[PDB]
């Protein structure tokens, strides 16, 4: 999808805009022999707030075969905690320490 | 005559005895040690103290070795290409000075 | 004797460059322990004999 | 009896994982789990490939 600056300045209030934002982290390095770019890719639209709130994980590939890529996101520990039922029935995370 | 022979009589006398004249494989056939500090193949050290003998130093055959290799094809297909750009005037070229 | 020269020649001119072929990464549990002690994570699908 | 509840098996959550792939990445080595470990671990692994 695309959004001209005109539309961003003139879209009615209360309409939900649907912006798109690339995660460029999984972009493999350019061939050594690709021609140089004389020009410059540019950008206008940015979020004011974090967008990736829904994101559990990111860049499930290896930098090298052993390093993590910069900006890679491991799953949160609580995604895997499956503790126990409370004395009354309610769900709980496992105790953090023995006490 | 049997210089080429690695092994012999791969069957059991009884179910547990070896047949007389049976030949087990030489240990070096299985040694697959390491690369030397410079790159060359070696047998494992014999004892804890001594360094491992180069495989090429001695007359044994070793049928396991560490082969270095690329992880994928080196012909990616991104062949180098250039922009040749000719002299503007053939008369103006400075042939001179080395 | 001719054979030996053409062996030596054919070796002096052996310009093969190895590339990793198809591999497998068996899980430890699939292998009997004696094999897992020899195996080092991945290995070529075309194991030779030994 | 009153139909107070909707008895069901193998429940669906309110939340689910979604996942976007860049298909050009693929590990060359091919992992071989036992069929059982594949039966359990597998649906996870196909998703987070």
């Amino acid at each position: 999808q695309h959004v001209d600056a005109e539309s961003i300045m003139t879209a009615p209030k209360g309409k939900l805009f649907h912006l798109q934002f690339m995660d460029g982290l999984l972009r493999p390095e350019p061939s050594a022999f690709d021609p140089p770019a004389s020009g410059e890719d540019m950008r206008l639209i940015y979020p004011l707030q974090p967008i990736s709130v829904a994101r559990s994980m990111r860049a499930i590939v290896n930098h090298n075969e052993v390093d993590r890529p910069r900006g890679a996101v491991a799953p949160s520990s609580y995604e895997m905690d499956t503790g126990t039922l409370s004395r009354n029935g309610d769900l709980l995370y496992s105790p953090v320490a023995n006490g | 005559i049997s210089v080429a022979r690695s092994m012999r009589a791969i069957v059991n006398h009884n179910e547990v005895d070896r047949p007389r004249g049976a030949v087990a494989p030489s240990s070096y056939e299985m040694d697959t040690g390491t690369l030397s500090r410079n790159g060359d193949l070696l047998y494992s050290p014999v004892a804890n103290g001594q360094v491992g003998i180069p495989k090429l130093e001695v007359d044994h055959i070793s049928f396991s070795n560490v082969v270095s290799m690329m992880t994928a094809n080196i012909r990616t297909g991104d062949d180098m290409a250039v922009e040749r750009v000719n002299p503007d005037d053939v008369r103006a070229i400075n042939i001179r000075n080395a | 004797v001719s054979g030996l020269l053409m062996v030596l020649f054919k070796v002096m001119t052996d310009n093969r460059l190895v590339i990793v072929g198809e591999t497998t990464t068996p899980m430890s549990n699939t292998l009997s322990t004696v094999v897992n002690n020899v195996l080092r994570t991945t290995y070529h699908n075309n194991v030779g004999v030994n | 009896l009153s139909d107070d509840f909707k008895q069901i098996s193998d429940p669906k959550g309110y939340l689910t994982y979604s996942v976007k792939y860049e298909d050009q990445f693929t590990k060359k080595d091919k992992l071989r789990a036992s069929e059982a470990d594949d039966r359990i671990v597998g649906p996870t692994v196909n998703l987070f490939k």
């Binding site: 590939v61 930098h63 890529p69 | 992880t71 | - | 050009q24």
Partner: peptide, 26 residues
Amino acid sequence: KIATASSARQADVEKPADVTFTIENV
């Protein structure tokens, strides 16, 4: 049935390296 003898030798498999288009790392 008569007793018999046979031979075997390990097979060659040395292919030219495959040209894959996939890549494993970022």
